[PDB]
Amino acid sequence: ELFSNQIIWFVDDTNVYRDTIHKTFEGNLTTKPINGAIFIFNPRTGQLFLKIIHTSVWAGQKRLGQLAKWKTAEEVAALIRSLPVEEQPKQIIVTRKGMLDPLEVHLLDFPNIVIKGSELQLPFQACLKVEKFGDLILKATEPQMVLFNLYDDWLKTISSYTAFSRLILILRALHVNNDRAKVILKPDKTTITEPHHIWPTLTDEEWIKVEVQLKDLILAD
């Protein structure tokens, strides 16, 4: 399925509508939208299209959580239209079932694209506390798209399958227990992440140990 000659995108809309809530001194709830993002991810190549969603899009609107699914579908369609046909996905896998109907209705001009849901646990939400992404999203003053390579230099020495599995363990572990996962991912005082990389520079042996530890962290839940 994944990794063939077919271009596949995972689309995660979870983080499009975000807010903070607090109690006023008068005892009422204040809900303040904050910037969000769509994650559109190619598991073969590691390519991420990060569409930052600025809070201005919600101006004058209600039911923002529901509207966000439709915004997501509109943005996926716009991205597809901006790409040459040879770069357009053959399959889009939505991580949440609420995306199925909105995306169906917005992709009617793309009969070659198959849309399906998934039960896979792919928490791109964890990226919001990876500082690179977190501050970029927080501080944006308008919508924009940013490209990333979520596999860093891994594909020089491992397959797409291996890289995808590593990424998922990282994201799930960060999701389950951010603080512990970050410790696991920094095995040495001298462990660094390159400025243009997302993840640390680790030896092959270090990654073996990391992968087991991340898996165990996810199991411990």
Ligand SMILES: [Cl-]
């Ligand atoms: Cl779902």
Ligand SMILES: [Cl-]
């Ligand atoms: Cl949903």
Ligand SMILES: [Cl-]
């Ligand atoms: Cl998870």
